A paper describes a structure:
FMOs typically employ the phosphorylated nicotinamide cofactor NADPH to reduce a molecule of FAD within the enzyme, which then reacts with molecular oxygen to form a (hydro)peroxy flavin species that is the catalytic oxidant in reaction. Natural variation within the phosphate binding region, and its influence on nicotinamide cofactor promiscuity, was explored through the cloning, expression, characterisation and structural studies of FMOs from Cellvibrio sp. The structures of CFMO and PSFMO revealed the context of the phosphate binding loop in each case, and also clarified the structure of the mobile helix–loop–helix motif that appears to shield the FAD-binding pocket from bulk solvent in this class of FMOs, a feature that was absent from the structure of SMFMO. In order to shed light on the nature of the cofactor binding loops in CFMO and PSFMO, the structures of each in complex with the flavin FAD were determined to resolutions of 2.39 Å and 1.83 Å, respectively.
Crystals of PSFMO grew in the P3221 space group, with one molecule in the asymmetric unit, although both size-exclusion studies (not shown), and the relationship of the monomer to its closest crystallographic symmetry partner, are strongly suggestive of an active dimer for PSFMO as with SMFMO and CFMO. Analysis of a dimer pair by PISA revealed an interfacial area of 955 Å2, with six H-bonds and 8 salt bridges formed between the monomers. In the case of PSFMO, there was electron density for each amino acid in the monomer from residue Met1 to Pro354, which allowed for the first time the observation of the entire backbone of the flexible helix–loop–helix structure, represented by residues 207–234 in PSFMO, and incorporating helices α9 and α10, over FAD that had been missing from SMFMO structures and only partially present in CFMO, although side-chain density for residues 222–227 was poor. FAD was again clearly visible in the omit map after building and refinement of the protein atoms, and was also modelled and refined successfully in the oxidised form, the density revealing no puckering of the tricyclic ring system that might be indicative of the reduced flavin. Superimposition of the putative phosphate binding sites of SMFMO and PSFMO revealed that the backbone Cα atoms of residues thought to be responsible for cofactor promiscuity in SMFMO, Gln193 and His194, are in the same position as those in PSFMO, Gln194 and Glu195.
Author numbering: -2 to 354
Amino acid sequence: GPAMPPILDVIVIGGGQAALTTAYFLRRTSLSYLLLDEQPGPGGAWLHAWDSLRLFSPAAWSSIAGWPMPSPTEPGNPTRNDVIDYLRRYEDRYQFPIQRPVRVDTVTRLDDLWRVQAGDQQWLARAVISATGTWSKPFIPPYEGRELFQGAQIHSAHYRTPAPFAGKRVMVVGGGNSGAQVLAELSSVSETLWITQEPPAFLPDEVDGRVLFERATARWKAQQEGRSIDEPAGGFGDIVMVPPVREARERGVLVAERPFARFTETGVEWADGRRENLDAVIWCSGFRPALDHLRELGVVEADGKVQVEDTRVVKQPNLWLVGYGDWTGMASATLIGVTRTARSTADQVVQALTATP
Ligand SMILES: Cc1cc2nc3c(=O)[nH]c(=O)nc-3n(C[C@H](O)[C@H](O)[C@H](O)COP(=O)(O)OP(=O)(O)OC[C@H]3O[C@@H](n4cnc5c(N)ncnc54)[C@H](O)[C@@H]3O)c2cc1C
C-alpha cells in the first residue's frame, strides 16, 4: 500500500480532546494528516485527573463536535473515567490517523515546510496545529522562601487522593473550580486554609458550567460585533456548586484569605502579622501552555504564551494553537468550547493549503 506521504499537509501535535476535535474537522477535507500523542493510549490530561473528579456540567454540555458524550447511567456529572472512555470511543468511531506514544521534541522551519521531530522519528508538514494542553506545565507563583518550607508541597497536577493528607493542616492556594474542589475534598480529612488572589465568586446553586460557556460566548460575539463590555467583568472562572463544593459550604469550609507574603520553615507569614503553621500546601495555581516543542522557534514569550490572532500564530507561517485557554479563543480549554476554534482552525488551514485544479 502507499507509503506515508513524504510531506503531510497537516501534523496535529497532541491526542486529547482538542486534537481529536481538530481531527474531526480535518476529516471532511482532502488534506493528509497525522496526530502525534505522547501517551500510551487515549484520554489526554484526564488520565492525570484526581480520582473523584467530575465535570462541572452534564454530558450534553461536555461534548466535542460530532458524536456526543454518552449520558452517565449513575447520578451526577460525568466522571474522569467517563471522559476518558468518551475520548477512547470517539477515536474508535472515527479511526483517525494517530501515532502513540510519540513525544514531539521540536518543530523546525526548513525550506517552507515544518519539520516535526520526536527523537529519531521526523516528519515534514505544510501546516502544524499544536493541541498539547496545559497539564504538563504546572505553574506555582514565585513566593519568597518556598525552598525553606519543610512540609509537603504538591501541585493539583499531581494530586490524586486525600489520604496522605489526613489529620494534617493543609493550605490550598488558588481559587477557581479546581481550588474549590480540592479544598472541599481535603477538608473532609484535614484542617484547611484557602488562599485566593481575590475573594472567590460562586455561581448559584441551581446552575452549572453552561453559564460559564454562555459568558465566554457572549465575550467572543462582542469581540466581533460592536466590541465593548468591561462592566461587568466576565467572571469566567466563577465556581460551580458541584456536590462536594455545596457540601463543603455547609461545613464552613469555603472561606479564603488573600495571599501571604512568604514561606517560613514551618508555614507561611503575611505582611500584617498573620502567621500560620502548615504540614502541606496544595498548589491549585494553574498551568502554562505545553509549548516546549516551539521554544526553538523563539515564539514562546516570558508568559509561556505565544502571540496569536484567534488560533493563528502571528510570527510564523502555517502554525496554529488550539485549545490552550481563553487566550486561544474564549472557552477553547473546555470540552464544549474547543469545537468553535477547532472548526475555524481547520478552515484556515484549508484556506492556506488548498490548491486550484
Ligand atoms: C482539574 C481540571 C478540571 C477540569 N474540569 C473541566 C470540566 O468540568 N469541563 C470542561 O469542559 N473542561 C474541564 N477542564 C478543562 C479542559 O477540558 C482540560 O484541561 C482538558 O484536558 C483540555 O484538553 P486538551 O485536549 O486541550 O489538552 P490535553 O487533555 O492535555 O491533551 C493534550 C495531549 O497532548 C499530549 N502532549 C503534550 N505535549 C506533547 C508533545 N510534545 N508531543 C506529543 N504529545 C503531547 C498530552 O500528553 C495529551 O495526551 C478541566 C481541567 C482540569 C485541569
